Amino acid sequence: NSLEIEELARFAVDEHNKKENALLEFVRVVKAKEQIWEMDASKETMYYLTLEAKDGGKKKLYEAKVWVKMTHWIGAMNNFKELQEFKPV
Amino acid sequence: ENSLEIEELARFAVDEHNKKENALLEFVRVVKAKEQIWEMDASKETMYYLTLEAKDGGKKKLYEAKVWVKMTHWIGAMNNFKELQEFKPV
Amino acid sequence: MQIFVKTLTGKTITLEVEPSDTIENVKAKIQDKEGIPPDQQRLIFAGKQLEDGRTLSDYNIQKESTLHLVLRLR
Amino acid sequence: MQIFVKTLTGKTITLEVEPSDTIENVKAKIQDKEGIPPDQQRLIFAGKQLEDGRTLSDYNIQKESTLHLVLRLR
């Protein structure tokens, strides 16, 4: 779980890096809260991650928002995740 | 050696087979594993050919599973889709 | 009653329906709202694909139920 | 030239196109081929969403290139 969040946090940083050519080092997760919607055949989660990353070797704080939808039916399951927001404090 | 992911795929094949037939096969191990991969832009499509060992009535037997996995990635987004396509005894 | 339809990325639309309605008729409702032809529509509920000739009540699709839609491209 | 369009589940259609063609024109090709309206079409290539005004050559979409399609519901 903490590790699962860590992957999402890294995902947010690596994807952020790709979009801006930004050079962020990932340091740790500071806070993590989630909103989940449960329905038939799916679980939707919005992750509100505050992670710490180094910009110039000096640690700084960033707000990431990752959207994850998992959908499953007989014989099949789908996992989709998306970075929706990445901003400094 | 990338084995745990195969084990998960094998289990997925077993539980989905079970869900579809209400059969309760108990997963023991992966015996053989071969896959076909197609590489394209922003995606990797893989067909898994798994030979697994399962207990039907407490007696272990061999089954052939086929799992289809498509991974699609773009900036800011990632998708993972998998499907059980075949589950048959030898 | 009201039901929801979602894509795998989480895009959501809402339809006003009756339990008497067929799956065939719901796909027509989706086409009218969104423009996606029914031959392109694979509808999912209760871990199953829904048959066109069948109705909503057959699948026990009550109010506030969520269906998911997958593109067929065929 | 020939290119591929795929859904996230792996459903595939083929279009005959030219590098001169716009993304707008491809969505029309898809609409004519599949019946899915262009306002519902989000086309992905080279880790990006494709804008209607740009051409295939702008995005370096050569022969046998594969695009991906996501439903907008909008």
Numbering used by the authors:
A (entry chain B): 33 to 121
B (entry chain D): 32 to 121
C (entry chain C), D (entry chain A): 1 to 74
Can you quote the paper on this entry?
In the K33 affimer, the mode of dimerization is different. Both variable loops extend the existing β strands, which leads to the formation of an intermolecular β sheet. Ub interactions are mediated by the elongated β sheet and are centered on W105 that contacts the I44 patch. Additionally, E76 forms a salt bridge with K6 of Ub. The structure also indicates how the affimer could bind to longer K33 polymers. Interestingly, whereas the affimer-bound K6 diUb does not resemble previous K6 crystal structures (Hospenthal et al., 2013, Virdee et al., 2010), the affimer-bound K33 diUb superimposes well with reported K33 diUb crystal structures (Kristariyanto et al., 2015, Michel et al., 2015). The latter also closely resembles a conformation adopted by K11 diUb (Bremm et al., 2010, Matsumoto et al., 2010), suggesting that the K33 affimer could be cross-specific with K11 polyUb. ITC measurements indeed confirm that the K33 affimer also dimerizes to bind K11 diUb tightly, with affinities slightly weaker than the K33 diUb but still in the low nM range. In contrast, the K33/K11 affimer is monomeric and only dimerizes upon diUb binding.
Ub can be ubiquitinated at any of eight primary amines (on the N-terminal amino group of M1 or the side chains of K6, K11, K27, K29, K33, K48, and K63), and all eight Ub linkage types co-exist in cells (Peng et al., 2003). Affimers are 12-kDa non-antibody scaffolds based on the cystatin fold (Tiede et al., 2014, Tiede et al., 2017), in which randomization of surface loops enables the generation of large (1010) libraries, against which epitopes can be screened and binders can be selected. To understand the observed linkage specificities, we determined crystal structures of the K6 and K33 affimers bound to their cognate diUb at 2.5 Å and 2.8 Å resolution, respectively. Both complexes show a conceptually similar interaction between affimers and diUb: each affimer molecule binds one Ub molecule and the affimer dimerizes to bind the two Ub moieties of a diUb in a linkage-specific manner. The variable loops are responsible for dimerization as well as Ub recognition, and specific dimerization provides two binding sites for Ub I44 patches with a defined distance and relative orientation, leading to specific, high-affinity recognition.
